[PDB]
Design a protein around this ligand. Structure first.
Ligand SMILES: *[C@@H]1O[C@H](CO)[C@@H](O[C@@H]2O[C@H](CO)[C@@H](O)[C@H](O)[C@H]2NC(C)=O)[C@H](O)[C@H]1NC(C)=O
Ligand SMILES: *[C@@H]1O[C@H](CO)[C@@H](O)[C@H](O)[C@H]1NC(C)=O
Ligand SMILES: *[C@@H]1O[C@H](CO)[C@@H](O)[C@H](O)[C@H]1NC(C)=O
Ligand SMILES: *[C@@H]1O[C@H](CO)[C@@H](O)[C@H](O)[C@H]1NC(C)=O
Lengths: 434, 118, 107, 434, 434, 118, 107, 118, 107
């Protein structure tokens, strides 16, 4: 019967999204064959390589890269120049327009270049391009790996910074991973001499085909695992043999929590600890002031459905279980706890009326037995001696599938099975046709 | 955006060495390049030293070879200008600036006038 | 080496007159082409940057534009404190080229 | 208590599917090295290019393409001939067999061709193939983009036709987009001289690697946003302080709609406006004729769950909210509105019986006070002066997860995370191994 | 009212997972151009080819492959040697480390090799690698196709073995499919001369880019379609005009099945037939022994929700319908069948009390009419001649969407639409930029 | 599938020009190629003009150079056959047809007999 | 140039007799090889197309087959109106080659 | 792991042919390669025949050409050693083994001593 | 051809003494390098395989290690039945090279 203000926080199932700078050198070699006045294109091959670390620093400092790439293979240095120009030209990063939702790219070269070769001789020309992509990388708890919008997967926690090995996963090679404090990065890659922002810690990883850089942030500062779902000031609290029940008619749902309270000093509630309190205080200063007072301290409960409840009555660790996406079951409790709280109370309003009534009649019989014992004898024999029908039938519910499985498989414009089958068909067309 | 305060006016005769201190005020930075210039009456500013924030190399190809030495440091970035063999042509106002703080903002220092007089 | 010409060399105007000053150079690309402001006995201070953004603290009475190798700075209304020496310059990486600077004064 | 025939239309969550003709020239260059009697294959490279527009017209008119491709790069024309044959041969489109579900392909070349080069000299041969794919492209509202089964995404509305810019999205370059009225296309690409069907409007887009063509259809004619879910003739209608309730025992569910009616002349109901009426009339001519009459005109309601209800009693704009996939909550209302309609009525059948009963006893006491005031004194004192137990306990429901998260992640034979990790491993094997 | 022990088996929605050996020859040709002391990398092309069948046998027998590959094109044999070494060297399969979850790979070559060419002359070198991948292939009923973790899709049933054509799908070419009885495969591919395990039947398929091998297992032996969900010894059984109802308070849910029993000799219950019985017997020997006896034989029922129930009371074919992932609807029946079993019984405990009470009063009136007819006249007139309020209001439930559609689209770190858009952008960058 | 009705019988002496109309009945088409042929007793049909639906070019390499001119039009596709310098060998039945309407269907016209008689 | 021979040149048969007529040509590929029907004083009309489909309105009493460079048209039961001139032809793109045509008549 | 039982001791004079049977006990196998060797006092074992499980080819390049013939069979894999032109140097203990059953396990047979004595 | 040397040729030790025996060869790679056990008048039996696993039925009193071209077999405690002839060998595919074998005995 006691009342309190509750704040329901849902599990942060949305992946933490951050900005990742992908630096990549695109070597696009176009080979053609020239014969008299007609040139025959012999083909093209495009590869992505990781620019050197000093070039990454130069890009982050000046928004400019170099038109030359060097790679060490078997002790031999192979150098590729842009447009077969053997100079050391420094090229600026200019935008390539496009939309790509949230995949803005800055490229030094915006047009493919290729010149025809000499007569009776094939010529191959390089089209090295310095591309920096500000991609959106999403990670999910326990954040052992994060992947960008493109096809890049890394086995490194976004918060690992060398000294956080025991608390943050790190499965990639330590040789390819670097940490730089007080690192300077350009604010805008599109123009040179842009403002250089300083960051406390930046992590770099030399991938096979590119270099992935990200600004290191504290896990408990920007990657909190609880998201505010809804606050309810008018909530009825009840106790049952194994559960605390919090029923809110604003959302028409009741949540059941175990017979224990989560410690307020838990490490998973940090960014919420103040926030969940603050809103509560705001509520205490918005709807139930003056005439009401805070009964007890703020408590934390974990419901059986996975939701988190911050409770403050007004007059011991969290688990890894996630919240249920569909909350109708909670509404089901609201369909029960109400009726269970109604029908029983109705009985408490009928039997209490009945027991008195049977008493009131009984005294009428008590004297009547002295005058007319026939009524008492009939009552104790329940036989002579000498309301409404029930439309509550069996309403067996059927499976109301609004959309069939065929309709469910065609909700989105992309189907993974069809794409994989098309890729297999492409492989067959390029290999099996031979 | 960064004030880049500089030491007050200094008076020194030619021949000996000149020391100038230029504090990196405004905000603790290790990103904005440092430029030391001099200005004389009748003309504008002329570049004399362009160096990185966290260190210095005293890049001077066409002007005053060996006459300028800059050290600076990290974090607070306290720039130190040192001049050897001071000449009469060096009587001018020296300025320290950051190359770009925000939106191509080259904020100059207060300016130290090296002037020889009585 | 590159050339730089800021025009006019010297000019005069009354209070509250729109004035345009031009800057020309042989730069390969646009670079930045910022515009400054200086007074006799005072350190130089910026006015405009990138031909699209202005220094904080300077009101919107100044504007900038450019085309080809020419860049113009326009003032809607001249004030008493607006008279002084103005400069245009280019700056890329660490290389920096400065301008002679126009002089604005009132008789 | 009033009754009416209802037709529940669900939101058309299934993507509109149409046929897209993808014309592509596959340049497959195979390079090998011949030494004496043993030939060493130096490799191969396969690229896809967009055939020229006149060649697209020739294909649509004759089911035949040309064995030569031309591309303009930096003012130079590069021409690639099929099987290094420098003629202008016209090749017919023959089927390549296969199944590919709904991705039938017609190719001029069904076998890869490559001849060994001369001794001590490498030779590269082209395998240009004209491939026309009748792919299935799916688009979802607001149809700002559609994607085929293969990896082709275009930022053009399927219904945009030049003059529909303000009502249909168009984000691609206008140079690469063309509209042709009364355009002629072959009925069957597999054989030459097929029947030439004429279409009122055909849209072409020169993609980077191919040309995508589609027949333009009216959005309000073939792409209606409402799908018929179910019709119910025996539905009870009720009114509540904020909602109209339509309860059907055929589906054992009740739908709640706001206290307003959607205008019948809405643009989103056009193809439904007649159809939803017609079925209604059919129902009025099937089960509830003669003895029943149509009370009121046909009305349109938008339920809180997103479903659309066409209502016709028998005796003001739609929103973008989509229908809920799981309708158990509606059944929950059927579990409530019934019991709320039962228990209360039970009270209306008990209290009405009780109030009369308490009255019937009262008169018995009314005269009795003149004869035996002791009973009346005891009744007004409720003390002497001189039924069943309640098994309705707290049945706290638990989360009956039929399939665990591990089981849910392995429902389909394709997992996107595993495929992306395999692609990353492929990139590492081709680059990091160096 | 009758009671019985039930075992609830859920549909095996998890795809059957088995181990597939993928043998592939990776031809990675690296071409470079050497000029004086600086070498210009001209590019690289990587292709995957299927090793010959005899080489597959040699690998399965010795964990070793050959450094040479042969392919027949247009009657000409093209042979590629590893690292341009024209010998017949036999190379062993050694692990390539990595994790790849469950995609362990054994490769003969662990480092890419390429040597610079002569001055003023380009050189291309081959990097042929024998790679055997122990991938996990998942198949879903009716198992007409299975796909591995990588991008390999085959139209062959995993259980087809030549003589099972009418019961197992086979859509691929019969030329590329082979069956080997008593086939010998190495236990560990990482080391030579490993233990040779013998298998009764192994199936091989020469794909376009590789060879896929799998051990054939009986469909009814390891690929049973029923998964044990739970069991309940305390279950109430009831009969209704169209359904048997099994209500368990342990799970707080009731399941409804049609008025028929599935034949015990059904082919889809084989591996379950004993197992579902055994647990039942265990239960009969665990909780309800001595004082209880098995009433009737074991029966099989198919619920309307798709679940399978093995029922044994204690004192006719299955369909393709799958079980509903969310079982709250079953709990909804537990919210109804309880209350329907309570309120009605409450009426059976009230009306039975009322009808007697109205009888007990009636006799009181029966004699009273002889003495005081006024009470009887008032009772038959219900007018003079000469309890509680109902808080049960309309609690209209709203759609409690815990996570919005934007949040639902960002649950996982991989989004298919974004990946496809990035692939389209890659195609535009490699082709449209020209 | 398309009837492709043609004008009635025409009688004209040789030497002057002959005009023949070929209405595009059946269905409004701009897809089926137009073929003009002539037929004489004792032999089958011989092609004389093959042209596009929406326009015409009078393609005639080996037969009757300059003696056949076709214009046609779009939509209704009313073909117009024009002959100059009529000769005695041209006395025959002229037919206009569509190359293929449905399933290789070359439907011919009614046929206009150009016959010189009294 | 290509050749074309339709056989027999002239033949006669009674009512209700199955008759096969052959057509041979030096075509590079199958092309279409349609079969027509003509009567004296009447415009020609098609009978079969693509050797697999027939003209609408013509019943199933006519059949077609082919192999190599030969193509046969078969009639199950000859009728009174079936006597006339028949043609076989090839047609690709706009190029068209016609046949001389067999004559069917009853004495 | 597989016992690979072998026939008992055999006594035969030189000159004639020797027959040895070696049953493939332990488990029905067609995977483990078969090796026939001989051992004489004062030295270790020397390989004489290495063959496939399901068949045999009697591979012997440097030792006793034509003097060893092995047949074996599938399933139970009953190896049959046949020797022609027996010599005094062949008096030794013959062993049959599988090359590897489990974890490099080369299990040998019981061993048949071919010894010439009275 | 390759060489093989098993050391010591002959040695003696008391009951319960740890003894190490070495095997050296000119093998290109590690191969397998299994270690055997034989007794006079008895068939040879394996002791160790792959330098990391032991034959089933043989207790853990034997150990193996290796480095470079040398491989050592170590016995913690010698028993009465442990005296005999030991061999080291290499075996790849079907090719097999055997060792002379050390002799262990007690006076
Ligand atoms: C390298 O040697 C292997 C065998 O040592 C050759 O494989 C043989 O190939 C032929 C067909 O060319 C088959 O008939 C044989 O059955 C194969 N041998 C085995 C043992 O299976 C291989 O061809 C040789 N490489 C080259 C380039 O010839
Ligand atoms: C980052 O490194 C510092 C040491 O420089 C360490 O104190 C801190 O805990 C690290 N960050 C995390 C999230 O552990
Ligand atoms: C298509 O274009 C016509 C004009 O030719 C225009 O009337 C019509 O509205 C367009 N289609 C759509 C869907 O807007
Ligand atoms: C496998 O083949 C055998 C015949 O060798 C056949 O009896 C058996 O039914 C086949 N397996 C299946 C699953 O049909």
């Amino acid at each position: 019967l006691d009342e309190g203000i509750m704040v329901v926080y849902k599990r942060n199932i949305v992946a933490h999204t951050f900005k990742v700078r992908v630096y990549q050198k695109v070597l696009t070699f176009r080979r053609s064959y020239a014969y008299h006045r007609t040139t025959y294109l012999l083909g093209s091959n495009t590869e992505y390589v990781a620019p050197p670390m000093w070039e990454i620093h130069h890009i982050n400092s000046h928004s400019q890269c170099y038109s030359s790439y060097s790679r060490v293979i078997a002790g031999t240095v192979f150098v590729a120049y842009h447009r077969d120009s053997y100079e050391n030209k420094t090229m600026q990063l200019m935008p390539d327009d496009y939309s790509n939702t949230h995949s803005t790219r800055y490229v030094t070269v915006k047009d493919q270049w290729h010149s025809r070769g000499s007569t009776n001789l094939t010529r191959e020309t390089s089209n090295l391009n310095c591309m920096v992509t500000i991609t959106t990388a999403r990670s999910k708890y326990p954040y052992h790996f994060f992947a960008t919008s493109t096809g890049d997967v890394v086995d490194i926690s976004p918060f690992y910074n060398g000294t956080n090995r025991n608390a943050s996963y790190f499965g990639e090679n330590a040789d390819k991973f670097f940490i730089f404090p007080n690192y300077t990065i350009v604010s805008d890659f599109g123009r040179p001499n842009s403002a250089l922002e300083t960051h406390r810690l930046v992590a770099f990883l030399e991938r096979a085909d590119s270099v992935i850089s990200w600004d290191i942030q504290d896990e408990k500062n920007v990657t909190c695992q609880l998201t505010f779902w809804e606050a309810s000031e008018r909530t009825i609290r009840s106790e049952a043999e194994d559960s605390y029940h919090f029923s809110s008619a604003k959302m028409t749902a009741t949540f059941l929590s175990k017979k224990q309270e989560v410690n307020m000093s838990d490490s998973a509630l940090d960014c919420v600890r103040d926030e969940a309190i603050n809103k509560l205080q705001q509520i205490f200063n918005t709807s139930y002031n003056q005439t009401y007072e805070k009964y007890g301290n703020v408590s934390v409960f974990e419901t059986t459905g996975g939701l988190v409840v911050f409770w403050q009555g007004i007059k011991t660790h969290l688990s890894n279980m996630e919240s249920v996406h569909n909350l109708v079951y909670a509404q089901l409790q609201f369909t029960y706890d109400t009726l269970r709280g109604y029908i029983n109370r109705a009985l408490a309003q009928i039997a209490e009326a009945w027991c008195v009534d049977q008493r009131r009649t009984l005294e009428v019989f008590k004297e009547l037995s002295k005058i007319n014992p026939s009524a008492i004898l009939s009552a104790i024999y329940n036989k002579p001696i000498a309301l409404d029908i029930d439309p509550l039938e069996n309403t067996d519910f059927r499976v109301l599938e609004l959309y069939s499985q065929k309709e469910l498989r065609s909700i989105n414009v992309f189907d993974l099975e069809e794409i994989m089958r098309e890729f297999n068909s492409y492989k067959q067309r390029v290999k099996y046709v031979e | 955006q960064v004030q880049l305060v500089q030491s007050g006016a200094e008076v020194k005769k030619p021949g000996e060495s000149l020391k100038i201190s230029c504090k990196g005020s405004g905000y603790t930075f290790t990103n904005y390049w440092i430029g030391w210039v001099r200005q004389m009456p009748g003309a504008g500013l002329e570049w004399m030293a362009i160096i990185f924030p966290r260190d210095s190399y005293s890049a001077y190809s066409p002007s005053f070879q060996g006459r300028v030495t800059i050290s600076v440091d990290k974090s607070i970035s306290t720039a130190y200008l040192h001049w050897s063999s001071l000449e009469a042509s060096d009587t001018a106002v020296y300025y320290c600036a950051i190359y770009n703080d925000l939106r191509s903002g080259n904020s100059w220092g207060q300016g130290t006038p090296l002037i020889v007089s009585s | 080496d590159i050339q730089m010409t800021q025009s006019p060399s010297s000019l005069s105007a009354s209070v509250g007159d729109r004035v345009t000053i031009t800057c020309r150079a042989s730069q390969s690309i646009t670079k930045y082409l910022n515009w400054y402001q200086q007074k006799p006995g005072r350190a130089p201070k910026l006015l405009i940057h990138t031909t699209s953004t202005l220094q904080s603290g300077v009101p919107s009475r100044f504007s900038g534009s450019g085309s080809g190798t020419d860049f113009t700075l326009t003032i809607s209304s001249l004030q008493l404190e607006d008279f002084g020496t103005y400069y245009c310059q280019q700056s890329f990486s660490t290389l920096w080229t400065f301008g002679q600077g126009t002089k604005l004064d009132i008789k």
